[PDB]
């Protein structure tokens, strides 16, 4: 686990180099973004229960065969384990958003998650549908004003969409 600032230092140390002036200014504008990054993380954790339980409700409506007897999410424990995995992935994606780096997300959330779902028999293509339903439920909740000053957050919301896409290809 290393953030976006330590990712630059880890690359410079293997070269034996100081950080040049064009690299410090690329890091001084990450500080300038700053408050806009913490506004995104505040908005996806304050609604973190609503992101999971709405995207789950919209996943068994499109795929009703998951909750039929014989489906992978039919029982009390198999339904609660379905909502559990979505909260874990959403937790680690917000760790990578506050870090600026997807290192913590694939260190300890995505390593072996694909081979876990093959062992259990869980359809990993339907798990990817659930990550994408949590993606746009939190992308749309990032770019609404609602107590924030007006400005451009377009590069940070594109960064947050990249973590949801990385988790959705590392699962199937």
């Amino acid at each position: 686990m290393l953030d976006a600032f330590a990712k630059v230092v880890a690359q410079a140390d293997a070269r034996g180099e100081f950080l040049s002036n064009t690299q410090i200014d690329a890091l001084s504008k990450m500080v300038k973004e700053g408050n806009q990054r913490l506004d995104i993380v505040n908005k996806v954790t304050s609604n973190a229960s609503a992101i999971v339980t709405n995207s789950a409700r919209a996943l068994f409506a499109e795929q009703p065969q998951l909750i039929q007897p014989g489906g992978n999410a039919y029982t009390s424990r198999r339904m609660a384990a379905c909502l559990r995995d979505m909260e874990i992935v959403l937790r680690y994606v917000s760790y990578a958003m506050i870090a600026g780096d997807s290192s913590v997300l694939d260190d300890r959330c995505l390593n072996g998650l694909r081979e876990t779902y093959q062992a259990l028999g869980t359809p990993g293509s339907s798990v990817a549908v659930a990550i994408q339903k949590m993606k746009d439920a939190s992308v749309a909740l990032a770019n609404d004003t609602t107590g924030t000053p007006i400005g451009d957050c377009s590069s940070l919301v594109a960064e947050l969409a990249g973590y949801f896409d990385r988790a959705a290809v590392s699962v199937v």
Partner: peptide, 26 residues
């Protein structure tokens, strides 16, 4: 993808390894 198993992503030890002393990761 990710790092290989066990490797803390970003703390690899083969970043700027010389080629003359490089050892292929099993």
């Amino acid at each position: 993808q990710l790092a290989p198993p066990g490797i803390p992503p970003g703390e690899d030890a083969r970043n700027n390894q010389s080629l003359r002393q490089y050892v292929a990761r099993p």
